[PDB]
Each structure stands twice: as structure tokens, then as C-alpha cells.
Amino acid sequence: ATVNQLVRKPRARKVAKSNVPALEACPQKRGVCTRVYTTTPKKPNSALRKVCRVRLTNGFEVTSYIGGEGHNLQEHSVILIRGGRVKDLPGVRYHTVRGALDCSGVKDRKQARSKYGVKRPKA
Amino acid sequence: SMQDPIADMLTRIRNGQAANKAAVTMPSSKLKVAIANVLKEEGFIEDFKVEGDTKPELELTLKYFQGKAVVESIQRVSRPGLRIYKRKDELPKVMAGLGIAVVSTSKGVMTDRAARQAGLGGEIICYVA
Amino acid sequence: NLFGEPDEGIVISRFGMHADVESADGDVHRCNIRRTIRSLVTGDRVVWRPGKPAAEGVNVKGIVEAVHERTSVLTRPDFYDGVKPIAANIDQIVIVSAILPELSLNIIDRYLVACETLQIEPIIVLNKIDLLDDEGMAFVNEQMDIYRNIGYRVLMVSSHTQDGLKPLEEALTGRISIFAGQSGVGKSSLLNALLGLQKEILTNDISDNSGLGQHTTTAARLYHFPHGGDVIDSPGVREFGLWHLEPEQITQGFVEFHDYLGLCKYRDCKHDTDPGCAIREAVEEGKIAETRFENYHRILESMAQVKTRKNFSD
RNA sequence: UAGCUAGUAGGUGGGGUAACGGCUCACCUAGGCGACGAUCCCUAGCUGGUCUGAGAGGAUGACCAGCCACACUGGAACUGAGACACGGUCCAGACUCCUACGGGAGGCAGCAGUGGGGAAUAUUGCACAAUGGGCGCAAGCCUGAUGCAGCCAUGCCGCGUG
RNA sequence: CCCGCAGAAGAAGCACCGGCUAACUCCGUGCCAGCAGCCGCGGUAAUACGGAGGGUGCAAGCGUUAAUCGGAAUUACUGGGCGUAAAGCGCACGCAGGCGGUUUGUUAAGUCAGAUGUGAAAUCCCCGGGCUCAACCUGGGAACUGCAUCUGAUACUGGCAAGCUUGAGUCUCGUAGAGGGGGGUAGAAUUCCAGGUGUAGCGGUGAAAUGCGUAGAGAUCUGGAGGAAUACCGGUGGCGAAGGCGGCCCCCUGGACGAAGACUGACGCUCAGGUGCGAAAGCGUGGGGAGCAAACAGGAUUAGAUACCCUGGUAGUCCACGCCG
RNA sequence: GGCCGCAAGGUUAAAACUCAAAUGAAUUGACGGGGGC
RNA sequence: CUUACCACUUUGUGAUUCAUGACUGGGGUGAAGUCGUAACAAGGUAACCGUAGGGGAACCUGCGGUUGGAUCA
Numbered sequence A: 001a002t003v004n005q006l007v008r009k010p011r012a013r014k015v016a017k018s019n020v021p022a023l024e025a026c027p028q029k030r031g032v033c034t035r036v037y038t039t040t041p042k043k044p045n046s047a048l049r050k051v052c053r054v055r056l057t058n059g060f061e062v063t064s065y066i067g068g069e070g071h072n073l074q075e076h077s078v079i080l081i082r083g084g085r086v087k088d089l090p091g092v093r094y095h096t097v098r099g100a101l102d103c104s105g106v107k108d109r110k111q112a113r114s115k116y117g118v119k120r121p122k123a
Numbered sequence B: 001s002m003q004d005p006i007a008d009m010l011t012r013i014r015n016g017q018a019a020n021k022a023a024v025t026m027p028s029s030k031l032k033v034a035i036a037n038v039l040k041e042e043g044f045i046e047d048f049k050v051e052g053d054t055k056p057e058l059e060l061t062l063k064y065f066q067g068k069a070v071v072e073s074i075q076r077v078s079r080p081g082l083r084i085y086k087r088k089d090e091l092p093k094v095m096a097g098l099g100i101a102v103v104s105t106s107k108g109v110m111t112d113r114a115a116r117q118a119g120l121g122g123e124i125i126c127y128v129a
Numbered sequence C: 001n002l003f004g005e006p007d008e009g010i011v012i013s014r015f016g017m018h019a020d021v022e023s024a025d026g027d028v029h030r031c032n033i034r035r036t037i038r039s040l041v042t043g044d045r046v047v048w049r050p051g052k053p054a055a056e057g058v059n060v061k062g063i064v065e066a067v068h069e070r071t072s073v074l075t076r077p078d079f080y081d082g083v084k085p086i087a088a089n090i091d092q093i094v095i096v097s098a099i100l101p102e103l104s105l106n107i108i109d110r111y112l113v114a115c116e117t118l119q120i121e122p123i124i125v126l127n128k129i130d131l132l133d134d135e136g137m138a139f140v141n142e143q144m145d146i147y148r149n150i151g152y153r154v155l156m157v158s159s160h161t162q163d164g165l166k167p168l169e170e171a172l173t174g175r176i177s178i179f180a181g182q183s184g185v186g187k188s189s190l191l192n193a194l195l196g197l198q199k200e201i202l203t204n205d206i207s208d209n210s211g212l213g214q215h216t217t218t219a220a221r222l223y224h225f226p227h228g229g230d231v232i233d234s235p236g237v238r239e240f241g242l243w244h245l246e247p248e249q250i251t252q253g254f255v256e257f258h259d260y261l262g263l264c265k266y267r268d269c270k271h272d273t274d275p276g277c278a279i280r281e282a283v284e285e286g287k288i289a290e291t292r293f294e295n296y297h298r299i300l301e302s303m304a305q306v307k308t309r310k311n312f313s314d
Numbered sequence D: 001u002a003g004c005u006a007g008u009a010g011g012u013g014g015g016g017u018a019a020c021g022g023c024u025c026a027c028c029u030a031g032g033c034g035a036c037g038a039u040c041c042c043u044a045g046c047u048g049g050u051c052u053g054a055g056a057g058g059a060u061g062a063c064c065a066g067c068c069a070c071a072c073u074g075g076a077a078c079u080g081a082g083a084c085a086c087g088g089u090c091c092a093g094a095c096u097c098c099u100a101c102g103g104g105a106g107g108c109a110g111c112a113g114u115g116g117g118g119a120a121u122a123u124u125g126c127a128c129a130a131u132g133g134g135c136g137c138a139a140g141c142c143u144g145a146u147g148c149a150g151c152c153a154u155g156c157c158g159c160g161u162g
Numbered sequence E: 001c002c003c004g005c006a007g008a009a010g011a012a013g014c015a016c017c018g019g020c021u022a023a024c025u026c027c028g029u030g031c032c033a034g035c036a037g038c039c040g041c042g043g044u045a046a047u048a049c050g051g052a053g054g055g056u057g058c059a060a061g062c063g064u065u066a067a068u069c070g071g072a073a074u075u076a077c078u079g080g081g082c083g084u085a086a087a088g089c090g091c092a093c094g095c096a097g098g099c100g101g102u103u104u105g106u107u108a109a110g111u112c113a114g115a116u117g118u119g120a121a122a123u124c125c126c127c128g129g130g131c132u133c134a135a136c137c138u139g140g141g142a143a144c145u146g147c148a149u150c151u152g153a154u155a156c157u158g159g160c161a162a163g164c165u166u167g168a169g170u171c172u173c174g175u176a177g178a179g180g181g182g183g184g185u186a187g188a189a190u191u192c193c194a195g196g197u198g199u200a201g202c203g204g205u206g207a208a209a210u211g212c213g214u215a216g217a218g219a220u221c222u223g224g225a226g227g228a229a230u231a232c233c234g235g236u237g238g239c240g241a242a243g244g245c246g247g248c249c250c251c252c253u254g255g256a257c258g259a260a261g262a263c264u265g266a267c268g269c270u271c272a273g274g275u276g277c278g279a280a281a282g283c284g285u286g287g288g289g290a291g292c293a294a295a296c297a298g299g300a301u302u303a304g305a306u307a308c309c310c311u312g313g314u315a316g317u318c319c320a321c322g323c324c325g
Numbered sequence F: 001g002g003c004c005g006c007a008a009g010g011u012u013a014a015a016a017c018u019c020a021a022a023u024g025a026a027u028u029g030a031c032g033g034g035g036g037c
Numbered sequence G: 001c002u003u004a005c006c007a008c009u010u011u012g013u014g015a016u017u018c019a020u021g022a023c024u025g026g027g028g029u030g031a032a033g034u035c036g037u038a039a040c041a042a043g044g045u046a047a048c049c050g051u052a053g054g055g056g057a058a059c060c061u062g063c064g065g066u067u068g069g070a071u072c073a
């Protein structure tokens, strides 16, 4: 309060906690799926979310979401994860880059193809 | 305890204006006399007088042009907890120069206008509007 | 797809978010439930499908899509919750009582009334006869005979010494039997003794302290009988009150009362002190068990106490 | 992370340095530092600046420029105006390589380039034509500095696809 | 860089369209599949999921992720708060520290003014110049808000010296007070013991039961023993820093207030660390133990009563000394 | 972890992880084994 | 050839740190299960604070304290 108090001890700002610690400020990371399982969402939402638990290159193990309808992911799959947050999935703060070196694009996706690694249909 | 008489004088003036008094009375001081002289010169206060010799008291006559207080804002800027000294160029302007800032320069106590017109910087005693 | 073709299955046990389902092949799996399903208890018959069995070298959670219509069901009214079922497709209930935790001619009567309203065949077993002395055994049998005198199958078994189970085993064969009763009566221990399940897997068993026992088993799990049929371990219960049942359904529940319906001069005979109440004099001469009459009256007056709630139970 | 410090803090004298100095030594004094944070621990090259912000501030130090430190790891000196020396010397260690098993050789954190790590970052290019630099009277030689080219939508700016 | 030839000829995608936020309809689906930055959507007409048409934005880019600042006054120096939303230590004393009544003199430390030196270039900004424009390069200027030195200024703060009495404190005379510590003592009342009278119940609850009573209870009278607390006064009352303090008296002792006068002469306020005090419960050792009463025993109620109620009842409650804080 | 305590524990005092709330006052109604007429 | 300084190293050890870890303690989130319903109205024995004891669980009881408690001429 008093300037004398600020002199005796200055104002310490609030450092921000990163909501994607496993990324280490890297835009993406590479990991291997150690387990693929179906989870349930928060009370407003009902579904069988397809998620995978992934052992990362930097030693971290985290659960990642798999967008789009269907996946070819299994055990021992080298996927690439990206930052993000799933509201209804508690403890899931990472997505999987559909189309990144093990996970293929979504089949017959026609709109927002770039968000799922679906090349432009030949037409 | 009383550790700043100047802020005391300022708040006496303020509360007297709020309570719509006609005259206030502080225990006088050379510095208090000089600040009162500035506000009488600037038409902020109608008049001031000092009485007594061993325990002199300063008395101020407050102004009310429309019954509303003539000095509608007054505040101590350089307090004992934190002193404020400004160089001549960066002297402040109260209400964009409509009001008056009292500053003690090496040549005595004068309005920011007189100070910067004399090219002198000093401790900013307070802002009177 | 990430899932196999749908198939019929039984509900071995229910655990909130997800249950245990046995396929016709006899392999049990943890399986989730769709939010459209509202009721799903042990013994239910469901259409489900398992997930593709490749994850961490173990099985992935299956999904249950729908449940078949129950044949029978055992329910119990719950304040703040209405009537809720414990286990469905049941064929027989076995009221398990034990002298040490509590002796309650009142809970047995409430269970009898319930199962009579549910048309399920009951059977009374009294556990831990090992604790009672031989005099005490002769002191418990001459009122356990109250029910066997109206045909009820009454057995006395000691789970710790495995004494006299053998007729219980016989009565249990080839049927679906829910083990019900107060907590601590020995329902889990009795199942361990009868099933003879592998030592590695046994039901939780904690001893009672002071007036009443703990609630160890908090689940309802089906178990395949060795000879034939199935049993179901159920969680212990404190109050089997019957406010959902209509007052007449309680007179019907007491089987020793049909011998006197229409023999009361007042047709709307409450049978307590109304003149000409046939069952009044019937119990005066000892035709009826006094304790049964008093229990009937007190459970009726209990329904008045628990009718305060405005919630519906239909 | 509350005490730390005995060459420690001073003085005299000797030695030593290009130069002052516990820089070093003998003796003497018993000091010195610390809550205005010593010591200890973790982290970190610094600045001009860069981003953001109305401003105060906040974050930061990629490119370019100035300073510093380092050259496989540890140590030491020589030569020299300048070094305790990236492409010098000696020793010790680890590793790699040659071996006649007797012993020897090496250091891309220079430019390309390879493997590896990573989400990720380029050619084993051309010329000393220019500007600098070394040597030389000069001619000239050397220069992966530098000037250019190659690759990449990485960014900014411009234009077209009528 | 200029000229010539041919031919529209070789060259458009990405995201979004529920609100925030510019852009909407059909079909499929039906709490499923799925979406989602936040609120959120989906169960039979879904502008929110997938496809299509239409539209919106940007464009050789467009989106997603990561990261920084901003918005965020959300660390509040500019520019925040603490009765109830987060936040006044339980209270007090007090060292360091922060701050400090009034007059005169001196000093010039802070402060202000001037001058000089310096603050590399680039970068940022302004006026121009050159690449066909721009990016880019470039001339000059401005700026570099800083630092240092010297010369002055003396109002304010600081230092020094001399004062002053208004802040603070001392003295004289009195007042009120459950302020504190120690020791006596009193009167009711509870319980117990002994005895006297005397009968059959007592006791307890909503109702009961347990329990006590024919050895004589309960009731009543007399005597005794012990412990604890002080009806009425009594209060919206007083005292104490807080916790707290209640019969009466004595001994020791703290503070507050009032009138008048004298005395000292800033001796003051606050206070990180530190020290002390500190309800009840609790702990150690040793006493004491009437009443009350966790635990425990019992009787009722109840599914149960492990509770509420009833009959008992231990630690404790009290004293001494420590501890706890 | 330090300090303190005989002990019970006290004091100083985080972080990982998780949510988009948590909260204060007041308004209208509804309800109460809350009152009044 | 010796002496001094001294890098490496060897013991006897101490401190500290990292990785792993037998075996565990509590926590968090989901929640459509189970047993009772603890609190919110006087929540049906007012809640809550400190402390002590007890109990499957929310909780019960003692002691002191608060109103952030209703009703009560």
C-alpha cells in the first residue's frame, strides 16, 4: 500500500501458467500412441470421444483428442499432437494433427479439409 | 500524531468549504502564511490574518461566488511520505491551466505560472482548483 | 468402426457410468451405457457390442445400446428418489437374516410383503447359528417356525462352519436367486461359502461393530452357480419401508390373512379394533402369529409417517 | 539460503609485474564483509536495441553493430608488440583412427556437408570483378572475409492470373 | 533495362456464415455420429454436426498451433483494495527502519537554474534524394528523455547551533471503577454421613422403563462433612491492551479522568524482526473432587439409536507449578 | 523443509492437477415441521 | 638429480543432487451405482469456530465462543 511498503518489497506480478506444458512452447510435438480408448464428456454432452494416450519425445505422457469421424490410430502409432483445449473432456488439452505422418485425413471430408489433412478432391 | 501541517491546512480549507463555513483557523506558520498569500493573490481566498505572537493563529475567509465553494478541489501532492520535485519544463498544469498549482521554488512560494515564467523549478506543494 | 457387431448379453453388475456385461460366449467386459437408457440394473438383458480388442494388449470399453424388457424385478422405494430397482429378471429372493447384527421380525415381514407384491417366491435363511448356544437354537427355532407353519422355506446356516448349507444349495440350484437382507447378516460370506470361488477373488467382508455392521458390498453382482442357476450379491439395506404399496396390498402380503377376508362384519375392516374383525379373534386363539399382526399394524402406521413426501412413486 | 571470511582485512619489509595492488613471501596487527541481503542455491552472456504499449511500463536480446567469454575435457607454459593462442606447443583424460602391437594420428562451436536429436532451418556452388585484410618496392599471390549464385511462400513490398 | 513474335493464351485457393462477428437455406442424422476460442449445439423442420447450393472475409496465400505485449486499472508509480465479495496480525510493548510541531542562524546534502563534456554508428521520427512504385538504400536534422563536472539559487526537505511551547511527559489536590495478585470470612443452595419422627412408595417422561425403597426409601427435623459458585443489587452499568473481571473485608499493586497552577522543552507517531500477555479444550507432575459431565454402562423410541429423552457415570471441570498459543 | 512443542499439534508455506465460475448485497416470486390478522 | 607449486587419480568419509524404485498416503476429476440423507425454512435436536472423545458414512456428544439464528409482552 504505502510507497514505503512497495520499497521494502516491490509489486510481484502474476506469471501465467501455460495450459499446454507438454509442448515446451513448441508449436507441435511428436509422440507414439501407447493406448487408444473411448471416454465420456461432461454432463451437458453425451458421446464416445475417441482419444489416445501418447508418450511424447520429451518424456511427457498426455491424452490427445482425435478429430473427425473415425481414426486409423492404434498402439505404437507415431502421431503429431498440437495445442488446444477440449471443454467437455477433463484433462484433455491436446489435439492430434489429422494428416500428420501416421494419422490419415478424414474420409470424404469436403469442407474445412485443411483442418483434417484432406487433400483437395481431384476435380 | 500530526506529521504534516500543510495537508492539515488544506483539509481544513476543504472541510470548511464543504460545511459551508465562513472562516477557518489554523495554527499559523511561515509556510502556511506564504501559501495563504498565494491563494489571496489568485482570488481563491478573500483574505487571511495572523494573530497572537507566542501561539499565533492564522485565520482565512473562504469565498462563495454563487454560494457554491470557490475552491472546489484542493489536494496535497508532495506529502511527507513521498516528496515531489519538478523541473521548470515539466511543471504541471491544473485543469489545463484553468486551475493553479502552488510550487515552492528557490525564490519563494509562487504559482506554476509565475514559476515557469521565471524559469524556476521546485517542490509542488499542492493543486488548487 | 472401433466396435464389434451387436449381440445379446446379461448385466453381471452395474457401476454408475459403466457396467459389467457378459456376452452369450461367457466373457465379461466393462461396457459404457448410452444416455438414452434410463434404468439398467444387474440381471438385465441388453443388446450391446464390444470394442475392437486391441489397446495396450487389453480390452477397450464396450458400448451398451439398449435393454430388453424385464420379466421380473425387485424394487424398493427411496425417499428423494422414488421406487428404484435392485435387480431384474429375478426368479427367487432369499431373505438373509443373522442373530448378531440384528434380529428383525419386522424387516422379514416387510420383505415378505414386498416379494408377495412382486410375485417372486421367497425363502428365509438365518445365518450365523454358530454364535447361538444349543438352548438359544431351540429359542430361535420356535419362532422361525412361524413362517414354516405358513409354508415358507426356513433354513438355518452357519457360513463360518459351512453348517447346514447343503439344503440351501439344493434350494438354490437351477434358479435365479438374489441374496437380500440387512448389512452384516453374512450375504457375502454365504456366497463365498456356497460358490466356492477362487481364493484370489472373494467378496469384501468386514466384521460388525457395536449395534450394527458396516456396508461392505456396495454393488449388486451376478454370480454363476456351480451346479446350475445364478445368484446375486446385493448391498445391505437399512429400511425396507413400503409407502409406495397401497394399504390393501399389505393385507394381501400377509399370507395368513386370506383365511379370514370377508369374515369381518364391517366390510371396510381395518382389523385393528373394529368390531367383528375375524383376524383379531384368530390371533386371540393363536391361529395367527401375534408378532405378525403387530408388525402389520406398525408398518401400516409407518406408511402414515412416510406419506409426508409429495413426490410420486408410480 | 543468516552468518561468512585466516592471505582472510590491514601494516612494515623483501620479491615479482609493463604498471598500482596480498600479486607473492616473512613478521605484525585482528581485522573485513553482512538485513542498504553478505554467503549459499537456481537461472542467465551484456548493451545499442527489438516487440508491444498513449505513456509509464511489459516481454526480450534472432539479424546488424559495440563489449565479454570459449575453441574435445582439465592444466601449464613458450614464442611474441600483442596468446597462456579455433585450423600452435606439452602433459593428463575420454573417444575415433593407423599399426609391423613395438608405438603413433586427430579435434568443423570456420565454409559447404554427414549421421543423430528435433515440429523445424538451405549447396559437399562461382569469383577474387568490386570493398576490406595478410605479405610484397611493385607486379602479384593468398583470402569459405566478402561479392554473387543455388534451395525454402520464412517474412515484407510489388505485379499478374485479362 | 529496351525492342520484336505468338496467342487469352501458362497461372486461385483457404477459412468462415448461432451470438460475440460480416455472411442462410435444403437434405442426411437424431444426446448417435460429431462441433466447439467463450457461452454453448445435437433426442424428428438442427441457420451451430456431415453433404450440397448461396453468401462473407482474405488472397498466392489462407487457416491451426506456439509465443509475447495489449485490451487487464487483473501487482494499480502513473493507476486498486481490506465491515459483509480475497484481504486489519488475538492484543500489547518495543530495537532497527519510515515519518515528524514552531522560530532564528549557518551549511548546500537532497532540490532547482545555467554552462560545459559526454550519451558510437545503425535503428525510431521529420524534411528530402535514388531504385519504373513500394519494400529497400540513402543525405541532413531531430531525438538519444541519461550520466558527469563546474558555477550559482536557498523557498522546501536534510545536517549544525541557539531557541519556543501548542505535541509529549512530570508534580500538587481529588473522583469513579466486577482492573490485577495474595489471605481471611459470610449466607443461601446441592450432595453425603449420623440420628429423631414415620409409612409405602420414591424417582422420571409426551407416555414409560431403567434405577432407589420395608435393612425404612422418598418426606420432615437436628447435628455434621466437603466442594464449587456468589440470587437480589444488575443496568442499553463500570473497569481492562486484548483474553477477560461480580458476595464482604484486609494487605500489595496498575491504569484512567477532573480543576488550578508550576515544571521540562519535540523528549513524538508507527514498528519488520524480538519480547510478553493471551477464552475454552488439551498435556505433565501432585492434590482435591459437591454439582455438572465427553467416554462408557443401562432403559425406552426406532429397521437400528450406535443420537435426541431417561437412570447412572470416568477423564475433565477446581488448586499449585509447568507446557500448549 | 525450518523453528517451536512432552505430545496433541502450532507457525512460516508451495506446487502439480482441475473448473468457468466461486462470491457479496439487494429485487420479484415460491416454500417453511416461521409468525400476525 | 633433487625441492616448491600443481592438473589427473586412490582411499577413508561427509554433504548435496539426479534417475529409478519395492511398499504406500492423501488428493483431484468424471459419474446416469450403493447406503443413509449431513446442510439450506426454527431443515424438523439452530447453524458455525476452536478443542477433546466416539462412530460405515455424511456426522454425534462434552467445554467455551459468535450471530453470519428463527419464534418470543
Ligand SMILES: Nc1nc2c(ncn2[C@@H]2O[C@H](COP(=O)(O)OP(=O)(O)NP(=O)(O)O)[C@@H](O)[C@H]2O)c(=O)[nH]1
Pocket (backbone or CB within 6 Å): C127, C128, C129, C130, C131, C157, C158, C159, C160, C161, C181, C182, C183, C184, C185, C186, C187, C188, C189, C190, C204, C205, C206, C207, C208, C213, C214, C215, C216, C217, C218, C235, C236, C237
Ligand atoms: N461369527 C460368524 N461371523 C460370520 C459368519 N458368516 C459371516 N460372518 C462374518 O460377518 C460379517 C458379515 O459381513 P458381510 O458378509 O459383508 O455382510 P453382508 O450381510 O453380506 N452385508 P454388507 O456387505 O452390507 O456388510 C463378516 O465379518 C463375516 O466374515 C458366521 O457364520 N459366523
Ligand SMILES: [Mg+2]
Pocket (backbone or CB within 6 Å): C078, C079, C080, C081
Ligand atoms: Mg438415494
Ligand SMILES: [Mg+2]
Pocket (backbone or CB within 6 Å): C186, C187, C188, C189, C203, C204, C216, C217, C233, C234, C235, C236
Ligand atoms: Mg456383502
Ligand SMILES: [Mg+2]
Pocket (backbone or CB within 6 Å): C309
Ligand atoms: Mg419435505
Ligand SMILES: [Mg+2]
Pocket (backbone or CB within 6 Å): none
Ligand atoms: Mg610491498
Ligand SMILES: [Mg+2]
Pocket (backbone or CB within 6 Å): none
Ligand atoms: Mg620493492
Ligand SMILES: [Mg+2]
Pocket (backbone or CB within 6 Å): D044
Ligand atoms: Mg547458459
Ligand SMILES: [Mg+2]
Pocket (backbone or CB within 6 Å): none
Ligand atoms: Mg495500458
Ligand SMILES: [Mg+2]
Pocket (backbone or CB within 6 Å): none
Ligand atoms: Mg535481460
Ligand SMILES: [Mg+2]
Pocket (backbone or CB within 6 Å): none
Ligand atoms: Mg545464430
Ligand SMILES: [Mg+2]
Pocket (backbone or CB within 6 Å): none
Ligand atoms: Mg563437438
Ligand SMILES: [Mg+2]
Pocket (backbone or CB within 6 Å): D080
Ligand atoms: Mg616474451
Ligand SMILES: [Mg+2]
Pocket (backbone or CB within 6 Å): none
Ligand atoms: Mg583467450
Ligand SMILES: [Mg+2]
Pocket (backbone or CB within 6 Å): D085
Ligand atoms: Mg591460431
Ligand SMILES: [Mg+2]
Pocket (backbone or CB within 6 Å): D086, D087, D108
Ligand atoms: Mg577446426
Ligand SMILES: [Mg+2]
Pocket (backbone or CB within 6 Å): D108
Ligand atoms: Mg557447419
